[PDB]
Structure 1
Amino acid sequence: QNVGTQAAEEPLNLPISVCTAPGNCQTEADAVVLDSNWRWAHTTTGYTNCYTGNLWDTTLCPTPETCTTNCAIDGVPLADWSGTYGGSVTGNKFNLKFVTVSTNIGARTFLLDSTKTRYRMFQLLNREFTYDVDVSSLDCGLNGALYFVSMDADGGAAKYPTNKGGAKYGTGYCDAQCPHDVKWINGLANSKDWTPIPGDANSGKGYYGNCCAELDIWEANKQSQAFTTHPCTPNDQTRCEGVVCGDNDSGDRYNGMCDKDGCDFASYRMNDHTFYGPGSTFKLDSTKPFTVVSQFITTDGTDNGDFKEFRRFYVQNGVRIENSKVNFPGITAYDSITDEMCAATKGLFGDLDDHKNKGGMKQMGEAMRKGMALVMSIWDDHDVNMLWLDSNYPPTGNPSTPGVARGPCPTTSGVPSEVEVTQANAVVSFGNIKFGPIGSTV
């Protein structure tokens, strides 16, 4: 995309901590940038929309190349962050409102480095990543997500010279779902064969998808939470078409370059329904804030080893809370993501181990070694109504069959039109982000 001249781009300042030992950290003066999908797209030498509602203008965008020549994405000024997009920062806390009323629904954002010209790339192997979260106002159907993806640090600017904005304009998004709803891919409008998504007034799908590796630290609302590894072959940003995208709609979910299911550790799905929930007698009380700690263990305990284990623990009101465990007869009580856990649990659930097909923890680790961009988002789910996270999936499945039940939400929950009314004022908060060696962040 070209860059427009109507509004300066002003990312929100967000300090994080880089740590060397427990309680010995230094501030890193980073910032938050809005994903290019949420930006106004208009004519390069005017005010005329190139995209309105869920459609590209066919006169301006008869082809992707012409669209890209004629159109530009514009900046987010400071005033518009809260007023238009529902984003705000107080000290080291970042807040994202779900619906902001001209009416904005959801948000996806990235962490910029201290220069505000590149994404802050995190080399996560043999490191610990930690943050405080509040998901108390997110119920069934919503997801306040924090995760990493194998985006380029410059959003693709060096690879795709028609991308003028780079990381500064939140470009280059890709993930392990190979999404077609990304409006700008490889420096070009994804306007070919663009199709609105029914019941989604703001979104559509273009000819291409954009694939890359994804490490989900946090997919969650107050009812259920998960962390998940998604390797791809290769891991780096890859525009896809046809079978390579692994499109759900053509029966290709397991035929593409990315592991779409991922290998998940989701406490409720692993059959501990009392670990996490909205109340003081759950082990971890989702009505109150808490700290989420993630440790990425290698084979030799060094930065050069292969990724072998994703460990997790929590801190809430000064109380250390170890992760829940897998709880099925004849299955080891795993409390972390490893290749063995993935094989054993997917075996039990009858899920295809595409994680293993894509190179497993080792391949996931190669993405983490090269460095990944931090994503913070809030969203509802127009495909599957978040049932995969917090309900029975498939909805018609027996909840006593291992793998089906992922949370207590009813199978009628999560319809975007309903959650966008009922949960309009939901806000996820991510704060006090800390990064360092294992054992350094609490």
Structure 2
Amino acid sequence: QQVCTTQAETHPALSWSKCTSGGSCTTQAGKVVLDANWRWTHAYPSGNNCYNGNTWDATLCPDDATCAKNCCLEGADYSGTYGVTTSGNQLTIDFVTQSANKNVGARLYLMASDTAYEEFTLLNNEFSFDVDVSALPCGLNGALYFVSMDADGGASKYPTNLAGAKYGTGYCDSQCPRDLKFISGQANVEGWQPSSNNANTGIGGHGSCCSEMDIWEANSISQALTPHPCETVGQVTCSGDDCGGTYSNNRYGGTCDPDGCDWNPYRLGNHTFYGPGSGFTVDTTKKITVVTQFSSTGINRYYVQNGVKFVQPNASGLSGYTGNTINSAYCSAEQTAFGGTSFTDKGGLTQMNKALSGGMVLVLSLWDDYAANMLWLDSTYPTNDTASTPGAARGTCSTSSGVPATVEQQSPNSKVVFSNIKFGPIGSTG
């Protein structure tokens, strides 16, 4: 895509800490950038909208290549349109923001500079952040995660991407998402189908696949930590159903693992660890520090709240696994007990570790779920199962919760607040 400037693009500043072996940390002057899908796209250098509602303009966009030549991305009013603000080391994302239109959430990337995403190599290192999920009810997901995106958004590979990282291009993840309007310097107009339950979204003929490490997906009720490997570490474009993922006729027919080897303490039999108020070990009405440590043998986790350190609880009642670590033994035991082969079919932790040994881009988002109402995170899922089905129970939310139109109407002032990001070798951030 091209770049237009009737709306200025200024990336909100966000401080974070880089720590070194020995525990010295120094402040990094980062910034964040809004994903290109949230932006206004119109004719370059000026003219009609290329995309409006959930359909493309056929004249401007007769094919994928011509569309990208004819259409530009605009700048973003982060606070006024998207409900995104920063202060020092703190980032806030509001759920519903009303201005010209109703905006729902956001997806943002941490930048090293105004033209480059920050690239984190996770293996042998740890990532720490603080989060306030108190204003995230059932059906919402405040997510902090990593994907194997190109640092320049693909600009050096695809000359028709003139927008680059400055405009939040180049997203990919383990779903091989097909809802993206621009992939690898081309529009996704050919075969585009509007969503039946969402006025603003659709599904195109291509998707964008890459490795993904979901450090944090959570609301005030439930949370999960999930590696997702892909057969190719970095970005690849897929076609149609061969993308796999939720919006495809065969979920597992692609090159990424859309399920992942997930660790949700509630799903793993600990129903008192995480939740609102003093009945839980980690009280979700108050700020939580979440630390995640990556090794060739596994992923370890601890929390700090009110100055008190709590390690990840052990899996409870999982046949053949007694630890608290995402390692190959856990991922196999999980598949054996709960079902599925996707994670190991796509190369498991060995393949995940290849992505963790290269640069990954930090993604911060807030979303509601137009496929499954977030029931997979915070309720019983699938709903035709009950608590007696192994792995069915993931949280205490009602099976009727999380319908997007309902949560958007009911809880529009929901928000997530991420802060105090720290990164360095294992043991260095604490």
Q: TM-score range by the shorter chain?
A: over 0.9
1:176 to 174, 177, 182: 174
Q: How does 1:288-307 map to 2 (within 5 A)?
A: 288-297=286-295, 307=296
Deviations 1:82-120 (A, max 9, x none): 11110001111000001101221110000000x221100
2:108 counterpart residue number:
109
Q: Measure the CA separation in 2 of the matches of 1:356 and 1:157.
A: 33
Q: How does 1:360-371 map to 2 (within 5 A)?
A: 360-371=348-359
2:231 pairs with 1:233: yes
Q: Measure the CA separation in 2 of the matches of 1:362 and 1:140.
A: 34
- Give, in angstroms, the shift of residue 204 of structure 1: 0.9
Q: How does 1:379-390 map to 2 (within 5 A)?
A: 379-390=367-378
In structure 1, runs of 5+ residues without a counterpart are 298-306
1:328 counterpart residue number:
317
1:393 counterpart residue number:
381
Question: Which secondary structure does the structure 2 equivalent of 1:81 belong to?
Answer: coil
CA contact (8 A) 1:22 1:441 kept: no
In structure 2, runs of 5+ residues without a counterpart are none
Q: Which moved more, 1:17-26 or 1:320-329?
A: 17-26
Q: How does 1:404-415 map to 2 (within 5 A)?
A: 404-415=392-403
2:334 pairs with 1:345: yes
1:301 counterpart residue number:
none
2:25 counterpart residue number:
25
1:89 to 66, 86, 94: 86
1:402 counterpart residue number:
390
CA contact (8 A) 1:181 1:204 kept: yes
Identity %: 54
Equivalenced residues, count: 428
Q: Measure the CA separation in 1 of the matches of 2:246 and 2:26.
A: 44
CA contact (8 A) 2:176 2:208 kept: yes
1:134 to 132, 148, 151: 132
CA contact (8 A) 2:207 2:240 kept: no
Q: 1:361 to 1:132 in 2, by over 3 A?
A: same
CA contact (8 A) 1:30 1:116 kept: no
- What is the RMSD of the two structures over their aligned residues, measured on CA atoms? 1.2
2:207 pairs with 1:209: yes
Q: Measure the CA separation in 2 of the matches of 1:108 and 1:122.
A: 18
2:304 to 300, 311, 315: 315
- Give, in angstroms, the shift of residue 261 of structure 1: 0.4
- Give, in angstroms, the shift of residue 243 of structure 1: 4.3
- Give, in angstroms, the shift of residue 356 of structure 1: 1.2
Amino acid in structure 1 at the alignment position of 2:122? L
CA contact (8 A) 1:191 1:206 kept: yes
1:267 counterpart residue number:
265
Deviations 1:309-354 (A, max 9, x none): 110000001010110221116432221211110001110112x122
CA contact (8 A) 1:81 1:87 kept: yes
Q: Measure the CA separation in 1 of the matches of 2:247 and 2:144.
A: 26
Q: Measure the CA separation in 2 of the matches of 1:353 and 1:146.
A: 25
- Give, in angstroms, the shift of residue 64 of structure 1: 1.4
Amino acid in structure 2 at the alignment position of 1:369? S
2:121 to 123, 143, 146: 123
What TM-score comes out, normalization by structure 1 length?
Answer: 0.95
- Give, in angstroms, the shift of residue 4 of structure 1: 1.0
1:13 counterpart residue number:
13
Deviations 1:179-225 (A, max 9, x none): 11011001011111211112212111111011000000001000100
CA contact (8 A) 1:136 1:288 kept: yes
Q: Measure the CA separation in 2 of the matches of 1:357 and 1:369.
A: 20
Q: How does 1:143-222 map to 2 (within 5 A)?
A: 143-222=141-220
CA contact (8 A) 1:199 1:417 kept: no
2:251 counterpart residue number:
253
CA contact (8 A) 2:319 2:337 kept: no
CA contact (8 A) 2:228 2:259 kept: yes
Amino acid in structure 1 at the alignment position of 2:192? W
Q: How does 1:367-378 map to 2 (within 5 A)?
A: 367-378=355-366
1:303 counterpart residue number:
none
**Structure 1 runs (4+) greater than 3 angstroms displaced:** 247-251
Question: Which secondary structure does the structure 2 equivalent of 1:370 belong to?
Answer: coil
- Give, in angstroms, the shift of residue 242 of structure 1: 3.6
Q: Measure the CA separation in 1 of the matches of 2:247 and 2:104.
A: 24
Q: Measure the CA separation in 1 of the matches of 2:335 and 2:22.
A: 36
